Design a binder for these strands. Structure first.
Ligand code: ZN
Ligand code: ZN
Ligand code: ZN
Length: 86
DNA sequence: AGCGTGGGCGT
DNA sequence: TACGCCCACGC
């Protein structure tokens, strides 16, 4: 069930967890509490800040098992590994 | 390709 | 509640 409803008028979104509603509300408030120290851009989410920072540093923690090519994000690696199929 | 950013959730 | 994985949609 999703007992936690968004109280903003135009919005009919609901959530299973209260913290997910609190995160969602930032969309409506525009709150972007996490600032990149390098370029000063602000982000809604701390995890998205971390991956953004890799655009500046070149850090690529995730290597393809088949070919060893490195990526900044796990989902980016995932999208890549499939190219090695038939 | 590079990468923003919500969806759902384990801890 | 925060932190931060995965997952997913969308340029
Ligand atoms: Zn809402
Ligand atoms: Zn930055
Ligand atoms: Zn590969």
């Amino acid at each position: 069930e999703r007992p936690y409803a968004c109280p903003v008028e135009s919005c009919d979104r609901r959530f299973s967890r209260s913290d997910e509603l609190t995160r969602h509300i930032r969309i409506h408030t525009g709150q972007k509490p996490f600032q990149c120290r390098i370029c000063m851009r602000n982000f809604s989410r701390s995890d998205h800040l971390t991956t953004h920072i890799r655009t500046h540093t070149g850090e690529k923690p995730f290597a393809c098992d088949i070919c060893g090519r490195k990526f900044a994000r796990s989902d980016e690696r995932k999208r890549h590994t499939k190219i090695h199929l038939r």
